[PDB]
């Protein structure tokens, strides 16, 4: 539908927030935590793409 | 920061899309798939809340 397309766009914006965060740097600690957040969102994108 | 607060709001909107989707119903197949999407987003909220 046009739904998954709309939820997908939502998650893509969420990745943009993460991606931006990663440009400001931090400890290896912070990087991994944010990469973990990014994985969660990407998992979201995968499910939503495999539903469609 | 005001970052996690902003990424959190993003994910919360994503849940709204899912929640809305679940009101239109479907097979047990579709429900689980969407509940799986919801889990991914909730996992994102958890990480982001445990970073803050």
Q: How many angstroms separate the CA atoms of A3 and A37, rounded?
A: 23
DSSP string, A1-52: --HHHHHHHHHHHHHHHHHHHTTS---HHHHHHHHHHHHHHHHHHHHHHHH-
Structural method: X-ray
- Asked if A4 and A44 count as a contact pair (C-beta separation under 8 A), the reply is no
CA distances, B2 to each of A17, A21, B8, B48 (Å)? 12, 12, 10, 12
**DSSP summary character for residue A25:** -
Residues of B in contact with A47 (CB under 8 A): 33, 36-37, 40
Chain A residues with beta carbon closer than 8 angstroms to that of B29? none
**CA–CA distance, B43 with A45 (Å, rounded to integer):** 13
Query: Quick one: tokens of B20?
Result: 């809305």
What's the CA gap between A45 and B41, in Å, rounded? 10
In residues, how long is chain A? Answer: 52
Q: Which helix (H) or strand (E) holds A26?
A: none
> What is the least distance, in Å, from the CA of A11 to any CA of chain B?
7
C-alpha to C-alpha distance for A41 and A14, rounded to whole angstroms: 7
* Closest chain B C-alpha to A23 CA, distance in angstroms: 13
Q: How far, CA to CA in Å, does B37 sit from each of A43, B5, B52?
A: 8, 21, 23
Resolution in angstroms comes to: 2.7
Tell me the chain A residues in contact with residue B34 when contact means C-beta distances shorter than 8 Å: 51
**CA neighbours closer than 13 Å in the CB half-sphere of residue B47:** 21
The token duo for A28 is 């290896």
Going by C-alpha positions, the residue among B14, B37, B13, B42 that lies closest to residue A37 is: B42
Domains, chain A: 1-52 (1.20.5.420)
């Amino acid at each position: 539908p046009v739904f998954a397309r709309e939820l997908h766009a939502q998650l893509v914006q969420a990745l943009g927030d993460v991606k931006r965060r990663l440009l400001r740097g931090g400890t290896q600690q912070q990087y991994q935590q944010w990469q973990q957040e990014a994985d969660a969102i990407e998992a979201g994108m995968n499910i939503i793409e495999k539903i469609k």
